[PDB]
Design a protein around this ligand. Structure first.
Ligand SMILES: NC(=O)CC[C@H](N)C(=O)O
Ligand SMILES: NC(=O)CC[C@H](N)C(=O)O
Ligand SMILES: NC(=O)CC[C@H](N)C(=O)O
Ligand SMILES: NC(=O)CC[C@H](N)C(=O)O
Ligand SMILES: NC(=O)CC[C@H](N)C(=O)O
Ligand SMILES: NC(=O)CC[C@H](N)C(=O)O
Ligand SMILES: NC(=O)CC[C@H](N)C(=O)O
Ligand SMILES: NC(=O)CC[C@H](N)C(=O)O
Ligand SMILES: [Mg+2]
Ligand SMILES: [Mg+2]
Ligand SMILES: [Mg+2]
Ligand SMILES: [Mg+2]
Lengths: 150, 150, 150, 150, 150, 150, 150, 150
């Protein structure tokens, strides 16, 4: 992609419902050229899809957690555990990181009870887990994963 | 909102470009009723906006980090630091969490050099920071923040 | 319950032996109305019971401890361990907390010897325990669990 | 005190509303002798008072926390900080312990918001605090501080 | 024992070769009375014995270490491990402490090689050991265990 | 010194009151030769002195502690702090160690109260102290610092 | 560079004194072509120089250490500290790493005394240092930094 | 060796390609005497070999790591693990250190992918590993292992 594609993506990351006319006017290119470039970005896997940004608070997702999970060494415990963590309802992010050399899991639940029932109790029953540490999010200063171009 | 709004949102969180006809058929309600419900969800702040999901790898965002930042106590150091962290280019998530009682910052950069220049060097110069710990993400098992309804 | 029940409880949390006449005068309601409200709070499980507050020092409870206990993951180790900890003589508080994701156990003993015999040696023999950390309380700045209404 | 006083206290720690007749029958001593022994235990400071045990859940005290607080060394920072912590609404327990050589603070709040407003923000503004770590209680396996005689 | 015994012990903790005449003059009691009191302190186990204080440096004991050793929970692992640690040549102190809830082992060796051969390799082969942390002493500011009366 | 001096010291480290006749018989050398060798070891600083080993329990030294103390960097804070720690009544051992790169302080007191008054409160008032961690000794498996030759 | 340069470097990383004839025979290229390629690798900064590998043990470098050093945040403390650490005699490696977000310093000394005098005492006097942790190397399983091509 | 050998080594540690004439002139000794001394240092194992110093950046070795690895206790797990770590492609340094009482492994790779494939995945599959912590090097302030004489 080129500089023009970047200007298009910079707009799309914020508003996926802008009309072709508007964007075409903002970037200074023919609407048909814009339509083509967007179609290609989708075909090339640059634009993976379009999602509605739903306010978690509107769904009463008040119990937000970030949990570190250490896995047992040997066999294929690490890889298998990552997959088990990602299948848990409420879990939207699972990363393996260096430093602590473990998994960081991001999840959202409506209440403590739901978190315990759907997440913690589940993880507590996995034998290949060595340790876990749940950080309760008490303030979201910023959460805009959609912004990839600053 | 009711059960019907939830079925609508469950679809919109995945595909914001579905036509009214398609969704109306999937949920079994008049297209005009659907259009109304969606307009209300937007007006009530439930649907905050629509974004294009861009593949970070397509933008060469290869240096992904999760950093813990501890703040000095006193005055208004904590609140002010959170805001400073959120203003850094590349930073998309800033949370204050219990447990470690500190900030967790999520950011993405193209390279180590960019991370050092735009993020680390910046944070290193803030006097009210007490400690920092950067976890380098080496594998993203899952990252679907758009999914709020499982 | 209403604001009046709260005024009643605020008094009862401090002095359970106050006469109906006194409280009735303090809150400005008929003694019979007070007697009724108290009877209902007991029936509804709001007031669980009335206890005498005994000075631990009078019983020579000089060895006060707060111990963190980590459990092995898998099976039903966590739940079962919590119950084993709560059955130990001298233990009055057992909590499972996030952050360290473990149990915090509050206990009181007359001496180091009693603590070792009744608590530590017991816990040391439980195989599903992974780690423990005992914090010796050397000063109680405040301990008024009875105060629920400030 | 003697063995008889201990039998009396063992009953009073559980039920402060038992009648003299009942206890006298249970322990096998004259009601007047019982009344005398109880009056003396109160006069000698053994029995500090009588409280109603109120169910925290009935007051919607759903956000339960245990926080470790480290103080700056020098001057009289430690002693002064302990007193500041004990004056915070919602705080019922403040202990200084060895091991971590810091304060452990027990508190209860109705919600995260109340905890942040009344406790965390307050503590965050105290300059002599070096570090804090809040453990969110997600399960109370046992909490019977009134039991001093097992 | 009384105040006089304490004055005697205060001298003996520093110089076990002082003559009865000298001590008798220093404390103001008959030499025969002194001889009697000392004989009784030995008989009662107060004075356990008399040792020559040898300068470790004179024996080339240059590799001084303080090692923390954590034991596996269950069976009788803890007690048995303490005894195994105390039987190691070079080990003069073994303590079980709260806080870290583990063993602290004090030892002295002539060289790194001797430490590795006699201590570390030995401990590394004990399966019930969970973790160890050796602190290398690089400066002895004070080491006077013989002083019990200040 | 030679092998003979080592055999002499091996005896003296255990019993400083053995008669010359006894030792001479045990090691197979003339009593006058023994007397000479011992006098030289004392003159050369090998034998620093002779102490009576007093049972700490006989002096009611029931509160035994091992405390780690971290010092502020800069100026001459480290060296000066070590000296301040060594001057505290009850402190018999002060070491600076690598690993934690801090001081390890060994002390003995009769009670918690004495420990707090004489040691902890004192250390709490030293501004150049960064952190402290007191490990309460609950069992002395072995404590024979006098043994330098195994 | 190409595959041929890599074969040349693979030999040079192990033996810088091999003759052109030998290498030319081993890789199958004209000696003059080899001489040219080597001259270019030096000119392009690929080959930085040629060093004699001296056995540290032959120089009595028996005290080997790896120290973590944390710096104060603010101003230009971090960058300046790294440079100060690199100027210390005996220090051959200084790295800033993520995870602990601090400096890792590799050094070698003949004795503990030299380490304390040349390194530790020096670092202890730098005010912008927050913490340090020295790991004493007791066994070098492998140390071949010269091997860049496996 | 003597002072003259040290002057020779001080030059050779920096430039192994200096001619005998040059060094002979710099140190003031006959070229034949120099040739002899160098030959002896090689024969005695002082000079282990001569290597070309290759710039890691020229080989695209951009992912530099320092990993701590803790081993399971018992059998011969420790010794065997050290050897397994040293056999991993990319690993140039393996040390066992006190303090953390574990292994520190230094390695270099071209990319994150290579590090994961060749190092991390390999180590993750070793059952006797208890924990690992990888520190990503983001800046090499100094790396001159060849310098043994300052
Ligand atoms: N430029 C526009 O916005 C629309 C007309 C133009 N010819 C096109 O096809 O794009
Ligand atoms: N039902 C549909 O999808 C469209 C027609 C319907 N009458 C409406 O207005 O929605
Ligand atoms: N008010 C009182 O305290 C007692 C009398 C009142 N009529 C009642 O029954 O409560
Ligand atoms: N024993 C009782 O319970 C009451 C009567 C008895 N004489 C008394 O004064 O206690
Ligand atoms: N007082 C002394 O020192 C010796 C003489 C004294 N009569 C005694 O037996 O002790
Ligand atoms: N050998 C002994 O124990 C004493 C007698 C011997 N001649 C000596 O002077 O030592
Ligand atoms: N090939 C060799 O090793 C030397 C001769 C060849 N012609 C050259 O110049 O390299
Ligand atoms: N001194 C030199 O550099 C060479 C000549 C001298 N005679 C020698 O053999 O070393
Ligand atoms: Mg999106
Ligand atoms: Mg009560
Ligand atoms: Mg002694
Ligand atoms: Mg070299």
């Amino acid at each position: 992609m080129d500089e023009i594609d970047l200007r298009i993506l910079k707009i799309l990351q914020y508003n996926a419902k802008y009309s072709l006319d508007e964007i075409a006017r903002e970037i200074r290119i023919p609407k048909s050229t814009l339509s083509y470039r967007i179609k290609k970005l989708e075909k090339d896997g640059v634009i993976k899809g379009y999602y509605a940004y739903i306010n978690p608070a509107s769904l009463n997702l008040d119990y937000i957690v970030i949990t570190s999970v250490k896995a047992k060494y040997g066999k294929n415990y690490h890889v298998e555990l990552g997959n088990k963590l990602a299948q848990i309802p409420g879990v939207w992010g699972v990363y393996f990181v260096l430093g602590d050399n473990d998994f960081i899991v991001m999840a959202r639940y409506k209440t403590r009870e739901e978190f315990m029932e759907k997440f913690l109790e589940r993880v507590m029953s996995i034998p290949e887990v060595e340790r876990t540490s749940t950080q309760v999010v008490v303030k979201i200063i910023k959460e805009s994963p959609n912004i990839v171009i600053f």
